Amino acid sequence: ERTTGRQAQISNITAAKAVADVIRTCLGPKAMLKMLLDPMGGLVLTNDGHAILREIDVAHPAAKSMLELSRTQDEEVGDGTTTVIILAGEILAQCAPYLIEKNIHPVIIIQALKKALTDALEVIKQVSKPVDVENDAAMKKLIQASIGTKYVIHWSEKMCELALDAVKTVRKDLGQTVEGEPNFEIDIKRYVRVEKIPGGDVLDSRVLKGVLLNKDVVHPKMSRHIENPRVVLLVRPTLVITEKGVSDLAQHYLLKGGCSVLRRVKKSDNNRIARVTGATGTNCGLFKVEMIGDEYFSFLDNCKEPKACTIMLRGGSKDILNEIDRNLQDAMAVARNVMLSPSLSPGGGATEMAVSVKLAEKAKQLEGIQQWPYQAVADAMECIPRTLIQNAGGDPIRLLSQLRAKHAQGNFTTGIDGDKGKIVDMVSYGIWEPEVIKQQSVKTAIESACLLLRVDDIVSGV
Template sequence: MYSGGQPVVVLNQNTKREQGRKVQLGNVQAGKTIADVIRTCLGPRAMLKMLMDPMGGICMTNDGNAILREITVQHPAAKSLIEVARTQDEEVGDGTTSVIILAGEVLQISEPFLTQNMHPTVIISAYRQALEDMQDILKGQVSMEVDVTNRDDMLRIIKSCIGTKIISKWSDLACTIALDAVSTVSMEENGRREIDIKRYAKVEKIPGGAIEDSCVLRGVMLNKDVVHPKMKRKITNPRICLLDCNLEYKKGESQTNIELSKETDFARILELEEEYIRQICADVIAVKPDLVITEKGVSDLAQHFLLKAGISVLRRVRKSDNNRIARACGATVVNRTDELKEEDVGTECGLFEVRKIGDEYFSYIEECKDPKACTIVLRGAGKDFLMEVERNLQDAMNVARNVMVDGRLTPGGGATEMAVAWALNEKAKSITGVEQWPYRAVAKSLEVIPRTLIQNCGANTIRTITALRAKHATPGNTTWGIDGESGNIVDMKEFGIWEPFSVKAQVYKTAVETAILLLRIDDIVSGTKKQAGGGDVPQQAAASEGPEA
């Protein structure tokens, strides 16, 4: 709508609007608030957060992504920061806490420039330049190649990643499980290594027993029992047939009403049902399987025919589990029984056995020759503990996957950040003009990671960070960082704490790009209605450390 040549923004009475510097400073504040919530969750001395969900369930964790998922926030900028943690988790599966702390710090350092009326475009331009240089420094000066076939090196790398988690007490076991699981599901396709942990490495949690009983199965385990008590519960070298169809009579939609005129009609209908089930069972029996697994139901009559043929049956198995079994034993999932062929039968499994653990029955399909899928069986004291162990294990598996896909490492314990910060400061001397200051500020913001590590283990922050700066000022000292347990300065090369290059690169990229995105916002228009009391709904940074009641 135009009035006298001037554009006019028309807002209704329920619409609130904030503009310009106020919005940018509000976004900075929101980022700082979210970063402060999980700042204490970094490093081996990390504190735990206790989260309560609306249903009254409790979750205790120091996993950045798990905490942010449960936090309820109102501010739109804070919501985008929480999305950042989710993106980081989906991309590389690690570094969720670091990315939020760094993004919050990069936003915070832009506050003085905004208050001095420096234009956001100038700040953003400097940030972009700094990000490009960070990636180059990381790849060229700080990272190093690693031999992914060396098992001891791989175990050491995974160990350094779970040192901050609850599972670190059983780190040798956890590292072995993570590496075995990832090696099992690793596949070479068209010259590229494909590792799909989410789909093919399933974690099954069974409360009870000791955590030392946890293991990786060379195959698949299901929380299922055979459908008939007389069916065989242990088969050596079974022939496995996988189905995605019902082994029962399925009435058509138009067959809901049937009119019977003669006494023999009902008997004929039963005969038709029996003939149909006899036929589909004959199709299955023709390929001589020992074990049939279907995603749908199996009728009593079908059970009878299959039992007579000496075949064991599992029914109502999840599609994802069926796909895992197909990869593990070399079978093909078939949608219709009349399409079953000899090559669809899986023969690469060494043992099928139903075992009872506690009150429940579990079907083990294991000892597969070359399984490209696996099940991780976790045992432990209670459900909450097992859930936290599973989260830790997922991080460990992601680290193993990242190193296998991109075999480069960077030193941990804040050493990478200090090395990159020092190199950026040196580069800043060659930059002229006002952009030099935001560029230097990005270098300073990287120090938040070692600084937080020092704070979390209660050491003297200023003295330690100054000594660390002095170490990195000497050329070639790129591996000096913080021992997260004691707060002392150590050489990460000797200390053995390494992080995957892909995680670090993703952390920097995501953190700086998120800060750039939030700085570009200069207008927030929200159509929230006024409350009954007449006051506006507050839209400033509101981050509560737990879900809304």
């Protein structure tokens, strides 16, 4: 019913820790598969953490809050879902003796995690290296990490070009000190939403800026090329577009007015038309209705970059385009992180080790009550690369101490390799990860870990 005293703080830690300890094997390319027992004869053979956590029944409400965090993290970026859950669960494990045995007030721990969150972001920015976002050949290699070892490996040459133009279409580079930093206003969900059309070719597939409709002209004889077409949503306009259907009586009335009637338009697509037009249609680029792939199309595009559109996907069949959907969306999440800042971070756990080394040295100069929980954070930052060591077959005791000693001498970009299993450099061997995932993994894990410690009693009632 209700849990008071110090026993409630233990139940809050073990709730999110029991879930994070099981998914420890889901991290890295060497991640081991998992097997769940359903009441039905089927089972889940995949190692994806997002699919497994949704099928696990939980009791304590702290585990339910960790499930909602994985859903938000999965929408921002494609991978790194299990990294946030494990990092948020290990912090509570290292702070367990301090909160219970040492009898340290929880707000002191919460206030220390907020101070360590700022210091953790400054270290990652120093370890990161500059990268050119305008190079078309460099962006294809950054996306290639999410391309290869997948069914798209045969089209990988065409996929890197298709994913490149898909990101370049939604992004626009604008900045100044007058109106501030717009941050490019990039949204994958609404603006980058794709429509799969059967037939065509993947190489010939292009990204058109606008809304694509399959409805053709309602009159047999009409001009298929308009100089300055004007889109009107519902002055003597050059075009008439209706959301619902249009009877044949209105065809002859608007025929003498020099405008085309277009019916059967979806409501969700009307919001994207306002970006290429502004109607609550002058300077419209191409009116060509020419049929492509035995299906009548329409071109709403123009000479401007509204940062809104519908990507037209074409391929050999519908089954091929279905796998491209989830593969292209996960590939653009890495390219979107490159445009958020011209910096890259070393993978394989090198970024996780770079924060723990600089945190222990800086915490000794503060000389305050917050110094003790900083050592628990540095130990939690080292568990992420150590988890990959346990899955790589190497000695977790030896490889952890030898890697930490190399940071005091060498650089912070030296991680752990999954294929080999020995300490190697990430930059020279071509292992890279974006910094935005590292920023979202540390920030969301600390913010979620503080909320779990703020509840000292479980209230039962409706």
